[PDB]
């Protein structure tokens, strides 16, 4: 018998996430204009389909791009996805607030690059949301006069 | 199992805007002065001040702005920005900030705003796990990019 099945419930970790650090065995991949200089925005985990949808932004050729990548889990436990080549992604450490991962990428020229990363989740609690909505109602502010800054196209550029 | 000692200064660091509401919609519309994306907040218990670092788009371009607020005896804070402001903290903890701001502009017009902000917390052990994995893979420290500080100091 090899290892046993892992009870996986990552669905609730879905939500807004941000990149803290990304390291690489090949500096070119994460330098300015690099394909892996990725600013995370959102992660969605589906325990039933065994997938993870990545939503992030990257600057290419002097232009900002919003990207969406779908990863599929394997018996191996790792995830595979297509993005600037083939990728084998492993979650090394995970909690309600952080994600530490290791990714192996092989580009169109067979070049292998190993990357490490630390991402943090932006947790918005129900208790705090309720406090905000009550206060907003107390001040006579209409719901239509409230702007969402977490999911908004018009935002500042990191570079 | 351990947690850092609770200090008001421990609340300083990267913060992000979640929601901002206004009695005057024009103030938070595109190019409005209060459509602020927070970057960092610095709390100083000694001086009774809070330094705000945010970005706001004006005339089609993003600007980085710094505002220093000073605490009053009644616990509220006063700050000069697009007129006079009295900022009150309604709820505050290690991860969230709910506030109410009263602004009176250069024309005597009053606007009341509400806001919800969240702190981005990076724990020591998580950082250590990242650095250990990074060295396990033979990655040089100079081959690591700090995305968080880039977002905290945009252009
Ligand atoms: C491999 C998928 C990309 O969208 C993420 C790259 C960052 C992980 C180090
Ligand atoms: C007064 C300076 C602060 O940045 C005010 C922001 C108001 C948000 C509710």
Swiss-Prot record, chain B:
It is found in: Secreted. It comes from the Eukaryota. The keyword Calcium does not apply. PROSITE patterns: LIPOCALIN (PS00213). Its main location: secreted. SUPFAM superfamilies: Lipocalins. The keyword Transport applies. This protein binds a wide variety of chemical odorants. Homodimer. This is Odorant-binding protein. It comes from Bos taurus. The lineage of its organism: Eukaryota, Metazoa, Chordata, Craniata, Vertebrata.
